[PDB]
Homo-oligomer: 291 residues x 3
């Protein structure tokens, strides 16, 4: 039996998360092993399986929740050999998936659905990353509601916010506590592009040119990058990226679509910190990351 | 041959239609019956499609979430002609759906499932949403819900972004007390209805719907409301009409444990305001056609 | 005639029937499940009804209700070592009711799982029962947690703003010990992650509590603050004078860390919390019924 074997096992839906680094013009290669679980010179044929991904979306999220659906990766963003040759004697070969991630919209949950048509499926959730992207701890980020023109004393918080890749040193967030799984046409309006500068200051500007959420940065946001060695595991390095910011924005889409509502102005203030666990015994900058 | 409602259907195939509650709740909804030149005198037969609605409820919500299900509108609350004649040449005709909405329980998500059984040679799942000048989705960001801890309301308050005000009659609506989930078990949910009546003198009447008042609703002070209108800066013909209600009350959540089992009620102090916005396109003389939903 | 099962309460929206069994001396307790012969005529046959465990009906329910993509919400088939019941039940000619004696051995049962005993009548000697076995003691059930404040550690000190929920479930461990999930940890989260936040609460005679984390390595960095206490009080209902309301209030304060909020896999910065306040359990007792189990109004 000929199948695929990713470094980590798939989730409850059969989707495997793969982490690819965004580098120089975002050209990066992922190596997916193909296993024969051999006295034959086998030419294995691989193809994009659009249909398995559609069936999974229906089965998991249903036709009634398309905002939660995985999106098939665009043909212009990837390339892989149609045929993989495993000579007689070998039982393992690698499928080199070459990605071109430049200008990828991380609004979508990109999946590359692969299948062995001639000797088994692989639903690869392609997650680009840089030194500033991932799941930030947002417990010190306070979101105050404007009540009678002034921010209220009572603050709302969440445990984490995702920083999505834009390029090699820029990421984006969804403003305040905006639901990261809300209607895609509506959530793209709350993107905040955050660029990491050499002097330790950040650039924070809304993605929406018309700035319908009326994003307004307060003061000069900053970031600090520090590293601690683990006590228990002495070769493990914990790398922290703390971002400190303050801004105002408005939720003008909470009523659902179509409906024009009274915007709810919010004051977002505090910090968020990203952790990256690195196994400094592994010299490769990508293989050393412990996801 | 198909149907054409003013707004396109949602993610489930259900089209929301807005019908004004008026004089004893008798209102007619004129629903276009489009053709996509018609050289035939066609007699298009319309029927209630109970089965498409049942299939949708199962497919979207499942048999295990009936509290989320759409309810087929009661036969006593609507009437429409079985046959719609579109003469040769016409290509577009209006189906007259006559509703009798008096004493409609807006606890239910009413749907009128229609189908074309004969085109005289297409479905419409109409979610009937009655409205008055005071119903819709109210902004509830200035509404604070305090939990009673050791007999006194706590300092920490909980808020939500919106609450729905459902039609009762022409000048009365209802809300679900505090932050009670508007999609919870229907038998439980109905116990938390607050009837809000808008008087001319600018004051309100707020009383629980439950005669036995099991949620121990107690109005504090006198609830008032303000109704104002502003003309838009950008679009000069657009009129923004605001209705703000100002209230304070106490109630108890005695259903959070599910059903059957008896729990310690959680008393809450609800205090603040809620505001409803209605966008009206002046230059359109009809009071229902000017609304931009 | 139709042969079926008849539990004291009717089944839920899913079709699972909740049965309450008391945790006693080494947790050995018997549940009596009646088997009924319904029909217009009198049973003139000596019927030998055959009962079996129906693994498949439970699997079908789990998939139909929660789907294959939410296994953390799934019911778990009860372990064969925790129950015993006769394979055959004899209803003699004349009778239409007999009882299936289900003998449970609940010692060391992990209440992390929603245990279901799926039963079926394979032969009526000429109907399914999905029993959700819920062990209970005098301290287990759904506690009101509105006075339980959870403060987030911001810059090494607990924040002024507190988060609360309406209820927390106290699950049976033994006859006088229960467990909770620390702070506001989701009781329906990934089970492998969920089990790490168990707090074993033991009710002592002097009115004090023992609160220790179940995880031997204490990865959640649980730290009890001061001495937690409990008070047990009773009020008689005004309207129904034989009804007794039993309250068990537990007063505690502790610190813990949520180190699993990111999902599984990638290691996150733990969020330290200060949990402080009280929780109260209500139990309604019908004093006219002398039996300690039959008197409880669930």
């Amino acid at each position: 039996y000929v199948s695929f074997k990713a470094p980590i096992a798939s989730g409850s839906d059969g989707v495997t998360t793969i982490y690819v680094r965004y580098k120089d013009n975002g050209k990066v290669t992922y190596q997916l092993p193909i296993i024969v679980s051999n006295s034959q010179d086998r030419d294995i044929h691989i193809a994009v399986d659009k249909d398995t991904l559609k069936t999974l979306n229906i089965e998991r999220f249903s036709l009634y929740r398309p905002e939660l659906w995985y999106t098939e990766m665009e043909e212009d963003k990837y390339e892989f050999p149609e045929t993989v040759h495993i000579p007689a004697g070998s039982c393992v070969e690698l499928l080199n998936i070459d990605f071109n991630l430049q200008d990828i919209d991380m609004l979508e949950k990109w999946v590359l659905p692969l299948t062995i048509v001639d000797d088994a499926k692989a639903l690869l959730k392609v997650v680009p990353f840089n030194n500033y992207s991932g799941s930030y701890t947002a417990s010190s980020m306070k979101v105050y509601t404007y009540i009678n023109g002034k921010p209220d004393t009572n603050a709302r918080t969440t445990d984490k916010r995702t920083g999505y890749v834009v390029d090699n040193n820029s990421i984006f967030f969804y403003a305040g506590l905006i639901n990261e799984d809300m209607d895609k046409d509506m959530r793209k309006k709350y993107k905040i592009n955050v660029h990491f500068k050499e002097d330790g200051t950040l650039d924070m500007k809304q993605d929406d040119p018309s700035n319908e959420m009326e994003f307004e940065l307060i003061g000069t946001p900053t970031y600090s990058s520090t590293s601690v060695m683990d006590a228990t595991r002495p070769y493990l390095e914990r790398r922290y990226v703390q971002i400190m910011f303050e801004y105002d924005f408005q939720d003008f889409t909470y009523g659902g679509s179509g409906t024009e509502v009274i915007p709810i102005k919010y004051r977002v203030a505090g910090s968020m910190t990203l952790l990256r666990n690195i196994n400094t015994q592994i010299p490769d900058e990508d293989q050393q990351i412990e996801w």
